[PDB]
């Protein structure tokens, strides 16, 4: 059985083939317009890929239950607090679902060998990708499913760390009801995994940590001249 609240969250999920196809196409034209001597570095393509993912994340939030009831200023504060966390959570879940070991699956539908990416990503991003892979492995061993994924999406979006909100009560309420729905859902559907609910919640600080460090690295890369919506959110 599925709590009705979780069904309402599921109804807000985007059309994933369409989201990925749109991003794939954008990046294809990008490289096509570029002449022989001005192709995008691999880090550069990842920045544009992340940029375009953020557009789809904003569109998802905008139309989502509860979020669409916030005034725009509250909506902006929430997204500014969690945009990198939603990026990384989406990345992690993509590896959980489609991930083979030794490769990374991108929002474009491309599968890339890890040895290729690790050669170019540099020590810091390799470290953060490695931590993310550790979460992938843990979530895979717990049978992390789509109902739990959308719960964590809304728990990341409706964060209690965001202050100066006009309607903090709504954010507090969504946090509490989604938590209660996830606690109930994991019991009913995975009764033998006592640790599942706790193991899911403990990933959120870890994703937060990875995401905040990811932001700090990218802000450094921007200040260093190595990098749109991505810059605005930074």
């Amino acid at each position: 059985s599925i709590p009705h609240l979780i069904l309402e969250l599921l109804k807000c999920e985007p059309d994933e083939p369409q989201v990925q196809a749109k991003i794939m196409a954008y990046l294809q034209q990008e490289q096509a317009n570029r002449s022989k001597h001005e192709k995008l570095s691999t880090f550069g393509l990842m920045c544009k890929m992340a940029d375009q993912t953020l557009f789809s994340i904003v569109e998802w939030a905008r139309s989502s239950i509860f979020f669409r009831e916030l005034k725009v200023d509250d909506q902006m504060k929430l997204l500014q607090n969690c945009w990198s966390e939603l990026l990384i959570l989406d990345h992690i879940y993509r590896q959980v679902v489609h991930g083979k070991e030794g490769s990374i699956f991108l929002v474009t539908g491309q599968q890339v060998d890890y040895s290729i990416i690790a050669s170019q990503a540099g020590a810091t991003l390799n470290n953060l990708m490695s931590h993310a892979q550790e979460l992938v492995a843990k979530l895979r061993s717990l049978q992390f499913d789509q109902r739990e994924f959308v719960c964590l999406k809304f728990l990341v979006l409706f964060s209690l760390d965001v202050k100066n909100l006009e309607n903090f009560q709504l954010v507090e309420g969504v946090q509490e009801q989604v938590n209660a729905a996830l606690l109930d859902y994991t019991m009913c559907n995975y009764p033998q995994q006592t640790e599942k609910f706790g193991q899911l919640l403990l990933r959120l600080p870890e994703i937060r940590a990875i995401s905040m460090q990811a932001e700090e690295y990218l802000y450094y890369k921007h200040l260093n001249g190595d990098v749109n919506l991505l810059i605005e959110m930074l």
């Binding site: 904003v58 569109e59 909506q75 902006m76 500014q80 919506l229 605005e232 959110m233």
Partner: peptide, 11 residues
């Protein structure tokens, strides 16, 4: 963040 406001307000 004018861009984020626009993405939330646009029709």
């Amino acid at each position: 963040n004018a861009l984020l406001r626009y993405l939330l307000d646009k029709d």
